[PDB]
Amino acid sequence: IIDGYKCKEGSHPWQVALLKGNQLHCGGVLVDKYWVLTAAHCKMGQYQVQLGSDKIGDQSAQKIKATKSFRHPGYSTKTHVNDIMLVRLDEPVKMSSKVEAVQLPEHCEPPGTSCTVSGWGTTTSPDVTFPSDLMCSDVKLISSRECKKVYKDLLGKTMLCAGIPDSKTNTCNGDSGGPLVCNDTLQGLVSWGTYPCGQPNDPGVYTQVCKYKRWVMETMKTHR
Numbered sequence: 001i002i003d004g005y006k007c008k009e010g011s012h013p014w015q016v017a018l019l020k021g022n023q024l025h026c027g028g029v030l031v032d033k034y035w036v037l038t039a040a041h042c043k044m045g046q047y048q049v050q051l052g053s054d055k056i057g058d059q060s061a062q063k064i065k066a067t068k069s070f071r072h073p074g075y076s077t078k079t080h081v082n083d084i085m086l087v088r089l090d091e092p093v094k095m096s097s098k099v100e101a102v103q104l105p106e107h108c109e110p111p112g113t114s115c116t117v118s119g120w121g122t123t124t125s126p127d128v129t130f131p132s133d134l135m136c137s138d139v140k141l142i143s144s145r146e147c148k149k150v151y152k153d154l155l156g157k158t159m160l161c162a163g164i165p166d167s168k169t170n171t172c173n174g175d176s177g178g179p180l181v182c183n184d185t186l187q188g189l190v191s192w193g194t195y196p197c198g199q200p201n202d203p204g205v206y207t208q209v210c211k212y213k214r215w216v217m218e219t220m221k222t223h224r
């Protein structure tokens with residue numbers, strides 16, 4: 001997170017870190033005791049999933065292994081559309097003041113809506129500096145039409161842009177797969193942006209979660 005702030009204790013109980021061994025690979029977001037949502041580009045054969053702390057690599061935090069991923073079948077490695085994935089935990093997490101699922105969206109929030117994105121990604125770019133504390137950036141949704149002035153044909157119908165005009169505050173490497181929360185619902189998953197990160201008037205690009213309600217619920221079903 002470029003030009004962010006340390007997230008307030010307890011305000012992000014759904015954030016998880018997806019670790020490759022012990023090292024940060026991506027962010028993700030708890031949606032259920034058994035399920036994490038993240039970007040498709042974050043996929044690995046297995047993960048260690050850190051829950052219930054703002055500190056990355058916290059030795060006191062719960063760590064649950066995960067080895068089953070469920071990408072959206074339309075995910076593209078070329079155009080980056082459908083960059084969304086569910087990951088099933090080996091064991092269920094216990095909920096607490098530090099651990100809680102985010103609320104999945106019922107509707108799509110419109111342009112101009114205030115949001116916050118969180119992650120342990122680098123706070124500088126292109127020289128990287130990885131923080132301990134979970135960082136936050138406050139950003140607003142940008143309409144397609146405005147976002148297309150920057151990204152043109154690269155933007156797909158289910159991508160969602162956010163930033164602040166003339167500000168550097170934004171996502172960066174390691175933030176991938178983390179939550180963009182607006183008006184108390186998950187509206188985005190961190191997907192991509194421009195590199196180097198945190199150039200004013202280069203919006204962050206997210207997967208637009210409200211366009212995948214059916215898929216998320218179907219894929220997670222525990223009954224008929």
Ligand SMILES: CC1=N[C@H](c2cn(S(=O)(=O)c3ccccc3Cl)c3ccc(C)cc23)CN1
Nearest residue numbers: 041080171172173176191192193194195197
């Ligand atoms: C979908 C996908 N995201 C991955 C990636 C990460 N970066 S990034 O430089 O680290 C980045 C810059 C700005 C904001 C957020 C981020 Cl994560 C990208 C920049 C541009 C593009 C096409 C992809 C990525 C690789 N694949």
Ligand SMILES: [Cl-]
Nearest residue numbers: 040041042077
């Ligand atoms: Cl990939």
Ligand SMILES: [Cl-]
Nearest residue numbers: 069070071072
């Ligand atoms: Cl998959």
